Amino acid sequence: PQITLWKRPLVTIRIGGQLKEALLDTGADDTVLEEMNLPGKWKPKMIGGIGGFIKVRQYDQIPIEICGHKAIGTVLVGPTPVNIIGRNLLTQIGCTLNF
Amino acid sequence: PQITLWKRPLVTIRIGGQLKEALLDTGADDTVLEEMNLPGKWKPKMIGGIGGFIKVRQYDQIPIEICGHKAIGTVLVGPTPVNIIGRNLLTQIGCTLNF
Ligand SMILES: CCC(CC)CN(C[C@@H](O)[C@H](Cc1ccccc1)NC(=O)O[C@H]1CO[C@H]2OCC[C@H]21)S(=O)(=O)c1ccc(CO)cc1
Fold first, then answer.
1. How, if at all, do strands A31-33 and A69-77 pair?
2. Among this protein's residues, is A60 annotated catalytic?
3. Chain B residue with minimal CA distance to A84?
4. Structural domain boundaries enclosing A30
5. Residues on chain A touching B94 (C-beta within 8 angstroms)
6. Mutation test residue for ligand 1: of B5, B8, B25, the one with most atoms within 8 Å of CB
7. B76 alpha carbon to ligand 1 midpoint, in Å?
8. Tally of structural domains, chain B
9. 3-class secondary structure for chain B?
10. CATH number at residue B28
11. A21 C-alpha to ligand 1 centroid (Å)
């Protein structure tokens, strides 16, 4: 579909047994999700934006369904105020910017 | 244009006769530029990002040409990690997300 930007580009995503609302975010290199206890190996990382940094856990090869489109890749999990679908997964679902 | 997302969507903007590089950021409500001088009245404001809150100077009705498309709107100046074009101006230049 086409998503205008009059409002936040929030869409429904699924990660296992959790449905969440997440921003389609061209400003984010990688996907960052709100705190959740995912299975598997991870590694610590610090990511920065307006206000400074937060600490996150990097999980790899996590499948996420984004508006019914399948994706699989890196997911950073930590105390973000909003779920953020970053470019690493936006490319996988065929997302472009157009004007 | 159509802009894919395998690389950061960085574009050249013209503001006050200066060329700068800025990131098209659909996860940003607001346009935020790194410290610079702009003429006219401004208002102190605060905004929050992934890492907390910062103080910015709010300038209204600033022209920016974004990849050759004209916008006139609110520009916040302050300690963002990188110049970002947010939805307030993305809407003005007709930017949508498509997948
Ligand atoms: C470095 C470029 C961006 C910061 C400038 C990166 N951010 C994505 C950005 O879209 C966030 C996404 C975002 C959205 C809401 C809350 C926190 C973070 N938006 C944001 O800070 O927008 C601010 C300007 O407009 C306001 O309206 C929304 C908050 C204000 S980020 O969230 O900090 C971020 C995301 C992922 C990574 C890992 O690659 C690193 C940083």
1. parallel
2. no
3. B27
4. 1-99
5. 99
6. B25
7. 14
8. 1
9. CEECCCCCCEEEEEECCEEEEEEECCCCCCCEECCCCCCCCCEEEEEEECCEEEEEEEEEEEEEEECCEEEEEEEEECCCCCCEECHHHHCCCCCEEEC
10. 2.40.70.10
11. 16
